[PDB]
Scaffold this active site. Structure first.
Site, PDB file in Angstrom:
ATOM      1  N   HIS A   1       1.277   1.600  -5.799  1.00 30.59           N
ATOM      2  CA  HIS A   1      -0.067   1.000  -5.859  1.00 30.59           C
ATOM      3  C   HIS A   1      -1.059   2.080  -6.336  1.00 30.59           C
ATOM      4  CE1 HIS A   1      -3.823  -0.926  -4.872  1.00 30.59           C
ATOM      5  NE2 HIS A   1      -4.120  -0.041  -3.911  1.00 30.59           N
TER       6      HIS A   1
ATOM      7  N   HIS B   1      -6.998   7.069  -2.927  1.00 27.72           N
ATOM      8  CA  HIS B   1      -7.835   6.075  -2.253  1.00 27.72           C
ATOM      9  C   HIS B   1      -7.187   5.307  -1.090  1.00 27.72           C
ATOM     10  CE1 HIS B   1      -5.958   2.948  -4.554  1.00 27.72           C
ATOM     11  NE2 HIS B   1      -6.530   2.071  -3.742  1.00 27.72           N
ATOM     12  N   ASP B   2      -5.834   5.253  -0.990  1.00 29.89           N
ATOM     13  CA  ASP B   2      -5.144   4.573   0.119  1.00 29.89           C
ATOM     14  C   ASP B   2      -4.197   5.538   0.864  1.00 29.89           C
ATOM     15  OD1 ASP B   2      -6.155   1.860   0.297  1.00 29.89           O
ATOM     16  OD2 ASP B   2      -4.933   1.258  -1.386  1.00 29.89           O
TER      17      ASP B   2
ATOM     18  N   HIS C   1       0.804  -1.233   0.000  1.00 33.22           N
ATOM     19  CA  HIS C   1       0.000   0.000   0.000  1.00 33.22           C
ATOM     20  C   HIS C   1       0.836   1.281   0.000  1.00 33.22           C
ATOM     21  CE1 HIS C   1      -3.339  -2.781   1.086  1.00 33.22           C
ATOM     22  NE2 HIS C   1      -3.930  -2.031   0.154  1.00 33.22           N
TER      23      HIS C   1
HETATM   24  C1  LIG Z   1     -10.701 -14.931   0.651  1.00 32.91           C
HETATM   25  O1  LIG Z   1     -10.349 -13.601   1.034  1.00 32.91           O
HETATM   26  C2  LIG Z   1      -9.086 -13.163   0.750  1.00 32.91           C
HETATM   27  C3  LIG Z   1      -8.091 -13.933   0.169  1.00 32.91           C
HETATM   28  C4  LIG Z   1      -6.866 -13.360  -0.131  1.00 32.91           C
HETATM   29  C5  LIG Z   1      -6.604 -12.026   0.152  1.00 32.91           C
HETATM   30  C6  LIG Z   1      -5.275 -11.406  -0.210  1.00 32.91           C
HETATM   31  C7  LIG Z   1      -5.405 -10.433  -1.324  1.00 32.91           C
HETATM   32  N1  LIG Z   1      -5.810  -9.249  -1.097  1.00 32.91           N
HETATM   33  N2  LIG Z   1      -5.738  -8.396  -2.245  1.00 32.91           N
HETATM   34  C8  LIG Z   1      -6.080  -7.066  -2.324  1.00 32.91           C
HETATM   35  C9  LIG Z   1      -6.555  -6.260  -1.163  1.00 32.91           C
HETATM   36  C10 LIG Z   1      -7.949  -6.729  -0.724  1.00 32.91           C
HETATM   37  C11 LIG Z   1      -9.092  -6.213  -1.605  1.00 32.91           C
HETATM   38  C12 LIG Z   1     -10.456  -6.405  -0.978  1.00 32.91           C
HETATM   39  C13 LIG Z   1     -11.568  -5.942  -1.889  1.00 32.91           C
HETATM   40  C14 LIG Z   1     -12.198  -4.722  -1.685  1.00 32.91           C
HETATM   41  C15 LIG Z   1     -13.220  -4.301  -2.521  1.00 32.91           C
HETATM   42  C16 LIG Z   1     -13.634  -5.101  -3.563  1.00 32.91           C
HETATM   43  C17 LIG Z   1     -12.995  -6.300  -3.793  1.00 32.91           C
HETATM   44  C18 LIG Z   1     -11.965  -6.712  -2.967  1.00 32.91           C
HETATM   45  C19 LIG Z   1      -5.550  -6.243   0.001  1.00 32.91           C
HETATM   46  C20 LIG Z   1      -4.115  -6.082  -0.451  1.00 32.91           C
HETATM   47  O2  LIG Z   1      -5.886  -5.213   0.929  1.00 32.91           O
HETATM   48  N3  LIG Z   1      -5.854  -6.627  -3.559  1.00 32.91           N
HETATM   49  C21 LIG Z   1      -5.341  -7.677  -4.298  1.00 32.91           C
HETATM   50  C22 LIG Z   1      -4.997  -7.489  -5.736  1.00 32.91           C
HETATM   51  C23 LIG Z   1      -5.272  -8.793  -3.512  1.00 32.91           C
HETATM   52  C24 LIG Z   1      -4.852 -10.163  -3.735  1.00 32.91           C
HETATM   53  O3  LIG Z   1      -4.471 -10.667  -4.784  1.00 32.91           O
HETATM   54  N4  LIG Z   1      -4.944 -10.919  -2.591  1.00 32.91           N
HETATM   55  C25 LIG Z   1      -7.595 -11.258   0.755  1.00 32.91           C
HETATM   56  C26 LIG Z   1      -8.831 -11.810   1.058  1.00 32.91           C
HETATM   57  O4  LIG Z   1      -9.862 -11.144   1.666  1.00 32.91           O
HETATM   58  C27 LIG Z   1      -9.674  -9.764   1.976  1.00 32.91           C
HETATM   59 MG   LIG Z   2      -7.642   0.546   0.481  1.00 32.35          MG
HETATM   60 ZN   LIG Z   3      -5.940   0.177  -2.900  1.00 34.75          ZN
END
Ligand SMILES: COc1ccc(Cc2nn3c([C@@H](CCCc4ccccc4)[C@@H](C)O)nc(C)c3c(=O)[nH]2)cc1OC
Ligand SMILES: [Mg+2]
Ligand SMILES: [Zn+2]
EC number: 3.1.4.17
Length: 338
Positions: free
Chosen positions: A82, A118-119, A78
């Site tokens: 990103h 956003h972050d 983050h």
């Molecule tokens: C079954 O649930 C999960 C499994 C694995 C993860 C790790 C993950 N989180 N992640 C994220 C976010 C979570 C995004 C949550 C989200 C929010 C709004 C709409 C969709 C997803 C993390 C880094 O904070 N972005 C990406 C590209 C990933 C990614 O490839 N993996 C996170 C999980 O839940 C949050």
């Molecule tokens: Mg965020």
């Molecule tokens: Zn983000």
């Protein structure tokens, strides 16, 4: 600061001069050197013609861009790169999906600025951590939910209200209000809890068909586009998704270590002794990311290649899952790890 001097006096470089493939879904914005990203943001805003459309003051915009970039910390995932890659995906949607046929110019502009912000000030810890660690952010926001997302929006407001950084201060009082309400709604849409709450409404919209005259469809679409931007690393080649998984789990496990240090039992996905990365990534790709890009494809047939790449990356996790079991001896021929 000489970074400001150059942004202000050198001129806004044309987007084509950045890379011949810059406006393609195959482009990886993380390949761009970090020192060139602020100029790239100006280049994208100019190419979308928002600077001329909204009569944005270029010195104010340069100061705003630099303040947003400085507003990111350096946890593994983050960070500013990103936010930059998320903003770049917004630009790709504008260039490849013809968003102007679905949304108002002000909504697309708000989406791009929201992507940048956003972050803001993310510390590498999630919403649950704020409550468990009893942070000041939890004290300020826990009773309303989306703790970090409320903080990201509050940081964006603080930047706009910093002397010389208000890129919207010449907007009518109606449009200025509109822009802040859009940024608030769009940033809050990045909380998984919000996406899960609106998912049925997104399905209904994709089922009945997008209605450009329905204000609720514009709002739902902006939420979907924001989440499609936030997860966009998954629409790139395998290599990009593998490195971004490394960064995410490094960040998550550093949180779990802090939790154990405070006497808390972290969730399995934040615990380096329990988390099983291929199962977690497959669950994320199959149950969260693929349905978002499938909805994007339902609404925009030109987005089919994005869903196909996410599905292809999901399949690759199944293909390499077996590598997480040590067969034979480790690389160093040692059983010392036992
Ligand atoms: C079954 O649930 C999960 C499994 C694995 C993860 C790790 C993950 N989180 N992640 C994220 C976010 C979570 C995004 C949550 C989200 C929010 C709004 C709409 C969709 C997803 C993390 C880094 O904070 N972005 C990406 C590209 C990933 C990614 O490839 N993996 C996170 C999980 O839940 C949050
Ligand atoms: Mg965020
Ligand atoms: Zn983000």
């Amino acid at each position: 600061d000489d970074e400001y001097t150059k942004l202000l006096h050198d001129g806004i470089q044309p987007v084509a001069a950045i890379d011949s493939n810059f406006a393609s879904f195959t482009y990886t914005p993380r390949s761009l050197p970090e020192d060139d990203t602020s100029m790239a943001i100006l280049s994208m805003l100019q190419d979308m013609n928002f600077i001329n459309n909204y009569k944005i003051d270029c010195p104010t915009l340069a100061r705003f861009c630099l303040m947003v970039k400085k507003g990111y910390r350096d946890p593994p995932y983050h960070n500013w790169m990103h936010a930059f890659s998320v903003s770049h995906f917004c630009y790709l949607l504008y260039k490849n999906l013809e968003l102007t046929n679905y949304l108002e110019d002000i909504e697309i502009f708000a989406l791009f600025i929201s992507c940048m912000c956003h972050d803001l000030d993310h510390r590498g810890t999630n919403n649950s951590f704020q409550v468990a660690s009893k942070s000041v952010l939890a004290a300020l926001y826990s009773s309303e939910g989306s703790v970090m997302e409320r903080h990201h929006f509050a940081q964006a407001i603080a930047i706009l209200n910093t002397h010389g950084c208000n890129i919207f201060d010449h907007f009518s009082r109606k449009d200025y209000q509109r822009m802040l309400d859009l940024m608030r709604d769009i940033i809050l849409a990045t909380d998984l809890a919000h996406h899960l709450r609106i998912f049925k409404d997104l399905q209904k919209m994709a089922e009945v068909g997008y209605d450009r005259n329905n204000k609720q469809h514009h709002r739902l679409l902006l939420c979907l586009l924001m989440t499609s931007c936030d997860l966009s690393d998954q629409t790139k080649g395998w290599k990009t998704t593998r490195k971004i998984a490394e960064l995410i789990y490094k960040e998550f496990f550093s949180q779990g270590d802090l939790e154990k240090a405070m006497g808390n039992r972290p969730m399995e996905m934040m615990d380096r002794e329990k988390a099983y990365i291929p199962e977690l990534q497959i669950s994320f790709m199959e149950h969260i990311a693929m349905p978002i890009y499938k909805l994007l494809q339902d609404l925009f047939p030109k987005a089919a290649e994005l869903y196909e790449r996410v599905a292809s990356n999901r399949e690759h996790w199944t293909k390499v899952s077996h590598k997480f079991t040590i067969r034979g001896l480790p690389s160093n021929n040692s059983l010392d790890f036992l």
